[PDB]
Scaffold this active site. Structure first.
Site, PDB file in Angstrom:
ATOM      1  N   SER A   1      -0.624  15.654 -12.203  1.00 33.83           N
ATOM      2  CA  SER A   1      -1.020  15.455 -13.385  1.00 33.83           C
ATOM      3  C   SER A   1      -1.052  16.326 -14.317  1.00 33.83           C
ATOM      4  CB  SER A   1      -2.050  14.439 -13.560  1.00 33.83           C
ATOM      5  OG  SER A   1      -2.548  14.108 -14.828  1.00 33.83           O
TER       6      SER A   1
ATOM      7  N   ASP B   1       0.867  -1.286   0.030  1.00 39.25           N
ATOM      8  CA  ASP B   1      -0.068   0.019   0.084  1.00 39.25           C
ATOM      9  C   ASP B   1       1.059   1.190   0.069  1.00 39.25           C
ATOM     10  OD1 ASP B   1      -1.971   1.909   0.267  1.00 39.25           O
ATOM     11  OD2 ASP B   1      -2.324   1.351   2.447  1.00 39.25           O
TER      12      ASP B   1
END
EC number: 3.4.23.22
Length: 330
Positions: free
Chosen positions: A199, A35
């Site tokens: 992004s 994770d």
């Protein structure tokens, strides 16, 4: 040193991925959920409340000659999906894909919430976010990666998750045969303890690319792609019959649909998520309403590039002095 381990979807939907991990002496192999959005290595154990164990393999520290109680240390964690676990702490030898760390904090669960009990395939979590998020008190502990780093050939690990197929976590090297083209690296902020990056935009299907900054985290422990409501609405508007359902808890779409792809930007590069990756199947057994793999982050407080996004790429988690993230197509 290096390590290389195969990671395998737990079910037909790729809800999560499990990777075998050797703990203790002699080795006890547990299948852990790696994770990158958390920083605790915790396991089902001989200390876990018996009624909260249902099929998991447990770590038994009393059977490990290298286990030592970390006296006074406790831990307690809550995840974004509302699940939680807590307990006490041992140090022991932990190996992943041939890479060994001695003195790793292994957090033994005394209690786990229902979602963990109900998932018989996940024996615990191995956190790979920054150690500043580790929950051990009163002495915070380091992640497996942080402990391994100095010994690694290169201070990196990579995630290469499969779509309905096994994939690989590598530590200490970049497998240049595992991706196509070049790797595009992008800046990381560690301010919130995550692999947080920005992004450069998105496209829906064959549509034009929208240049827009989207701050979010690369999180292998989250199944879906959670993005701003504007972006998600633009995606689902291209699917006939798709709608947001408050009763179901997100966007659903007709199971008869063919889903468009979704592209996200990494610098000037582009990662394309095929439409099939966005299908999470019937909302309930036999239903003709299917659950979407792109959902709104509104009310989460952060955008999350979870498995839906990451499995479309070869992803480099660069833990050099200034961390960065790399993405390549594959």
């Amino acid at each position: 040193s290096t390590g290389s381990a195969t990671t395998t979807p737990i079910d037909s939907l790729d809800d999560a991925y499990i990777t075998p991990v050797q703990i203790g002496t002699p080795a006890q192999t547990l299948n852990l959920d790696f994770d990158t959005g958390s920083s605790d290595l915790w396991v089902f154990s001989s200390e876990t409340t018996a009624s909260e164990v249902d099929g998991q393999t447990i770590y038994t520290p009393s059977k490990s000659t290298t286990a030592k109680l970390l006296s006074g240390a406790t831990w307690s964690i809550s995840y974004g999906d509302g699940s939680s676990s807590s307990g006490d702490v041992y140090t022991d030898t932990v190996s992943v894909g041939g890479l060994t760390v001695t003195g790793q904090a292994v957090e033994s669960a005394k209690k786990v919430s229902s979602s963990f009990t109900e998932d018989s395939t996940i024996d615990g979590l191995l956190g790979l976010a920054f150690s500043t998020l580790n929950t051990v008190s009163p002495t915070q502990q380091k992640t497996f990666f942080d402990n391994a780093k100095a010994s690694l050939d290169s201070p990196v690990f990579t995630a290469d998750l499969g779509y309905h197929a096994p994939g690989t976590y590598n530590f200490g090297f970049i497998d240049t045969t595992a991706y196509t083209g070049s790797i595009t690296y992008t800046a990381v902020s560690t301010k919130q303890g995550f692999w947080e990056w920005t992004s450069t935009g998105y496209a829906v299907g064959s549509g034009t690319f929208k240049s827009t900054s989207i701050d979010g985290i690369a999180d292998t422990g989250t199944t879906l792609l959670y993005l701003p409501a504007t972006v998600v609405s633009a995606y689902w508007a291209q699917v006939s019959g798709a709608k947001s359902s408050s009763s179901v808890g997100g966007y659903v779409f007709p199971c008869s649909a063919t889903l468009p792809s979704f592209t996200f930007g990494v610098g000037s590069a582009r990662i394309v998520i095929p439409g099939d990756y966005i299908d999470f199947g019937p909302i309930s057994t036999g239903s003709s309403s299917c659950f979407g793999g792109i959902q709104s982050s509104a009310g989460i407080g952060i955008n999350i590039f979870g498995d839906v996004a990451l499995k479309a790429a070869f992803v480099v988690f660069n833990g050099a002095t200034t961390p960065t993230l790399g993405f390549a197509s594959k």
